[PDB]
Amino acid sequence: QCESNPCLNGGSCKDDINSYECWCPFGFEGKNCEL
Amino acid sequence: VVPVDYHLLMMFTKAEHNAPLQAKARVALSSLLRLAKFEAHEVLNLHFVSEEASREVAKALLRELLPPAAGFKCKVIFHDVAVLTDKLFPVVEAMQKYFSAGSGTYYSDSIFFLSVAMHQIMPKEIPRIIQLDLDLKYKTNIRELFEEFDNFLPGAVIGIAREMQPVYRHTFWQFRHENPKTRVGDPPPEGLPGFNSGVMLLNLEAMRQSPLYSHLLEPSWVQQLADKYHFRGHLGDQDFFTMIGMEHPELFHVLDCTWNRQLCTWWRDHGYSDVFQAYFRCEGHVKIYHGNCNTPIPE
Ligand SMILES: *[C@@H]1O[C@H](CO)[C@@H](O)[C@H](O[C@H]2OC[C@@H](O)[C@H](O[C@H]3OC[C@@H](O)[C@H](O)[C@H]3O)[C@H]2O)[C@H]1O
Numbered sequence: 001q002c003e004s005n006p007c008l009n010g011g012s013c014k015d016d017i018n019s020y021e022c023w024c025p026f027g028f029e030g031k032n033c034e035l
Numbered sequence: 036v037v038p039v040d041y042h043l044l045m046m047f048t049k050a051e052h053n054a055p056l057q058a059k060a061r062v063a064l065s066s067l068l069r070l071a072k073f074e075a076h077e078v079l080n081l082h083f084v085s086e087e088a089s090r091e092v093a094k095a096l097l098r099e100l101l102p103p104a105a106g107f108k109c110k111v112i113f114h115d116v117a118v119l120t121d122k123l124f125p126v127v128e129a130m131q132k133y134f135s136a137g138s139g140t141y142y143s144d145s146i147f148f149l150s151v152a153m154h155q156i157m158p159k160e161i162p163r164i165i166q167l168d169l170d171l172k173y174k175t176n177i178r179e180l181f182e183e184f185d186n187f188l189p190g191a192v193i194g195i196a197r198e199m200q201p202v203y204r205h206t207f208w209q210f211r212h213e214n215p216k217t218r219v220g221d222p223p224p225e226g227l228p229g230f231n232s233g234v235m236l237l238n239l240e241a242m243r244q245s246p247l248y249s250h251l252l253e254p255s256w257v258q259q260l261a262d263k264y265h266f267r268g269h270l271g272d273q274d275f276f277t278m279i280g281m282e283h284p285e286l287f288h289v290l291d292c293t294w295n296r297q298l299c300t301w302w303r304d305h306g307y308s309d310v311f312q313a314y315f316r317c318e319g320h321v322k323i324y325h326g327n328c329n330t331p332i333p334e
């Protein structure tokens with residue numbers, strides 16, 4: 001399987017090769033919406 | 036006496052040297068068997084989808100659990116994952132790019148769509164089958180689940196419980212953005228939060244006999260809806276049914292949450308603290324716990 005993409009855009013899997021930006025659900029920040 | 040068969044199907048693959056999976060399987064199958072009761076002429080058929088090493092593992096587990104306490108007739112059947120994968124592929128290929136991790140279309144993902152084409156895979160002598168995850172714990176007689184087939188309204192082909200996390204609220208983000216007033220991805224009792232595939236009542240006859248259901252399996256329908264919903268997933272059958280459930284909720288008899296009480300809270304801690312509770316609430320007497328995302332089941 002793959003880990004869900006925490007970003008709102010791009011593919012279903014985190015670190016989607018064709019995704020450049022990461023829009024995080026409200027209240028989270030980072031390249032993986034960590035903080 | 037006119038023998039009456041009941042059919043369950045479980046995926047059980049890559050189980051050699053997977054002790055966590057074997058222990059889950061052990062909890063599921065012992066609870067199932069300890070609590071099951073069937074009349075004398077009835078037989079419970081346990082179908083397992085497995086490659087050859089996992090077939091051997093399952094046989095070792097099963098011999099320890101059979102015959103069941105309750106002394107009813109039980110038959111075990113194995114289906115080769117490789118054979119099923121090749122039968123599924125023509126039907127299922129076009130959906131894979133939308134619902135598999137991540138892209139594009141790999142044989143290894145085809146088996147995760149088994150339920151969507153189960154009516155083309157199982158012989159015609161099987162009219163109905165219940166597909167179940169192995170990370171379940173049964174708190175009642177599985178025979179009772181079969182009466183839910185009786186509650187299918189005309190046109191319904193599948194019985195399935197709602198997804199109890201906001202994963203589809205997240206997945207449908209763009210569609211929700213473009214359609215502020217949508218119920219798509221909202222929590223119950225009035226939202227459409229999508230489906231969980233851990234427990235599914237596949238009415239094979241009704242699936243075979245539905246013009247609507249057959250059409251939705253067509254490559255161009257799959258593509259039109261995935262475009263309309265801007266939908267991308269990696270959860271396979273669960274994603275496809277969720278999607279077509281947005282367009283055609285008539286197809287699905289929604290099971291009560293107590294028939295698939297999901298324990299996973301991964302999404303709570305990934306951006307959905309506020310709303311999480313509204314998705315996750317389930318009350319009533321629990322019939323099946325589902326320890327999804329490797330969540331310990333309580334006792
Ligand atoms: C996002 O990625 C995380 C980390 O890998 C997963 O834990 C999430 O999946 C969990 O939350 C959503 C549930 O729908 C999912 O459970 C389903 O798994 C697919 C089906 O095969 C299964 O029966 C169903 O329970 C759960 O694992 C993921 O969204």
Ligand SMILES: O=c1ccn([C@@H]2O[C@H](COP(=O)(O)OP(=O)(O)O)[C@@H](O)[C@H]2O)c(=O)[nH]1
Nearest residue numbers: 045046047048049167168169170327328329
């Ligand atoms: O390596 C695997 C992974 C999954 N499964 C089957 O498919 C389900 C999918 O994942 P699981 O239930 O372990 O986690 P969930 O998907 O419910 O989070 C399991 O219950 C098993 O029946 C399997 O047979 N082998």
Ligand SMILES: [Mn+2]
Nearest residue numbers: 168170233327
């Ligand atoms: Mn599960």
